Write a protein that binds this ligand. Structure first.
Ligand SMILES: O=[N+]([O-])c1ccc2nn[nH]c2c1
Length: 300
């Protein structure tokens, strides 16, 4: 019944974290497990663009406010995001075709969310899923209308709104060192940072199939070679939840000096987006699964 967050702090890392929101914190044993075992919380949905600005200039913070207040009262660090992510856009954003108009909408969205929680958020995921699988930039509304400067603009705008935040770019399928996407994000982040773009971290959205944990041992050092101050594992779940896959991911974290922590996608299996693959660390009784105990043994 040991706390993985307490144990990973003992190994010199910052946090073992989890995604949650108001609808989980108010039912079952989610809050008790988060209180005991995790040191950082993220809003699964309540800070996404469609949740917070469902119509232009009309903001909804009730869910995000609840999460931030709960975390502060319970001694937890807070991550927020995603500020710019095409798959969470409300419909009104995608029909804007003017560069100046979309730039202003994007900056206003960033600045409004970050100002409301200024000083309270350790990490912001500023841009997500900006890359195609071949390493090219994904042709989203932001790329199509603003161009590739939208990423520099988003990060500079975020730094100005809350300079004490750690600003991350995140993506998925960065789990293999030989995959073109993994190399591409490293090379682009190096170029952006040399030009003064304030990218503090790369966050790897780590949705794994069985047996893919071993690859992260080589991919994570490659991500860290971009020279960002931090890297992190985000949104972690593993089909089958095998102890071997989870332990390999934890050990990749421990092996990479700049990796500050790990965030898992959720608490209990039935609430996973792929519950049929039983991919989390607690079962539907809110009891720890073998993978949880394997992490504990590994961290000791
Ligand atoms: O790590 N996460 O579980 C997580 C969840 C939702 C997010 N939105 N932006 N970044 C996120 C990270």
């Amino acid at each position: 019944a040991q706390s993985v967050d307490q144990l990973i702090k003992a190994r010199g890392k910052v946090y073992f974290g989890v995604a949650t929101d108001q609808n989980r914190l108010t039912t079952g044993k989610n809050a008790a497990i988060i209180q005991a075992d995790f040191g950082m919380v993220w809003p699964e949905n309540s800070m996404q663009w469609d949740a917070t600005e469902p119509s232009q200039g009309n903001f909804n913070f009730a869910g995000a406010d609840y999460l931030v207040n709960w975390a502060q009262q319970n001694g937890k660090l807070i991550g927020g995001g995603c500020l710019v992510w095409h798959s969470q856009l409300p419909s009104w954003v995608s029909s804007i075709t003017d560069k100046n108009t979309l730039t202003n909408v994007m900056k206003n969205h960033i600045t409004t969310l970050m100002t409301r929680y200024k000083g309270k958020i350790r990490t912001w995921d500023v841009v997500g899923e900006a890359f195609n699988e071949d390493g090219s930039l994904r042709q989203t509304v932001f790329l199509n209308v603003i161009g590739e400067d939208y990423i520099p603009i988003a990060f500079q705008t975020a730094r100005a709104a809350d300079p004490n935040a750690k600003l991350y770019i995140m993506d998925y399928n960065l789990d293999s060192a030989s995959y073109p996407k993994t190399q591409a994000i490293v090379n682009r982040v190096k170029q952006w940072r040399a030009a003064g773009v304030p990218i503090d971290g790369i966050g790897s959205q780590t949705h794994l199939s069985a047996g893919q944990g071993a690859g992260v041992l080589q991919a994570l050092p490659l991500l860290a070679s971009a020279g960002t101050p931090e890297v992190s594992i985000l949104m972690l779940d593993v089909a089958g939840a095998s102890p071997t896959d989870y332990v390999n991911v934890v050990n990749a974290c421990l092996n990479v000096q700049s990796c500050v922590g790990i965030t898992v996608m959720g608490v209990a299996d039935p609430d996973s987006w792929r519950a049929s693959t039983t991919p989390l660390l607690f079962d539907g009784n809110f009891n720890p699964k073998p993978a949880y105990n394997a992490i504990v043994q590994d961290l000791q």
